[PDB]
C-alpha cells in the first residue's frame, strides 16, 4: 500500500471510498515526487485523477475530493493539479473548472475556487 500506480489510484478515486488513501503522504514524501508528476496523469492528454473524480460521482456527492485536495497542498508542486489542464490537441487549456462545470454541479466549483484556481484560465 506504499507504493502507488496511476490505475490504483484511479480506482481508488472512482469508487468515491478514502479510507484507503493513507499512504499516499508517505509515498511522496519518501519518493520526493509530487501528485502532479506524469506517473499519474495519462500521458496522451494530460488528464488527472482530478479529472477522473470529478467525472465520475455518485448522485453527485464525491468524498475523496477533499482528501485528494488537502493532501495535494499539503506536499505537491505551486500548482495542486486546478491550474494542471489537458495538453492534447483536441483540448489544448481544458482545465478541471470546465469538466466540473459541464455537469451543471456547484458544489464541486465551491471546493474548487475555495481551493484556489484560475476562472480566467481558457481553453
Given at each position: 500500500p506504499n507504493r502507488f500506480d496511476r490505475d490504483r489510484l484511479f480506482s481508488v478515486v472512482s469508487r468515491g471510498?478514502?479510507?484507503?488513501?493513507?499512504?499516499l503522504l508517505e509515498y511522496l514524501r519518501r519518493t520526493s515526487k509530487?501528485?502532479?508528476?506524469?506517473?499519474?496523469?495519462?500521458?496522451?492528454?494530460?488528464?488527472?485523477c482530478l479529472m477522473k473524480a470529478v467525472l465520475n460521482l455518485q448522485d453527485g456527492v464525491n468524498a475523496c475530493i477533499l482528501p485528494l485536495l488537502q493532501i495535494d497542498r499539503d506536499?505537491?508542486?505551486?500548482?495542486?493539479?486546478?491550474n494542471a489542464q489537458c495538453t492534447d490537441e483536441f483540448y489544448r487549456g481544458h482545465s478541471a473548472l470546465h469538466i466540473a462545470i459541464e455537469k451543471r454541479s456547484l458544489w464541486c466549483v465551491k471546493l474548487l475556487v475555495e481551493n484556489g484556481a484560475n476562472v480566467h484560465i481558457r481553453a
Open positions: 471510498v478514502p479510507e484507503e488513501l493513507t499512504g509530487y501528485l502532479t508528476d506524469s506517473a499519474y496523469t495519462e500521458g496522451s492528454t494530460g488528464k488527472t506536499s505537491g508542486n505551486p500548482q495542486p493539479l486546478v
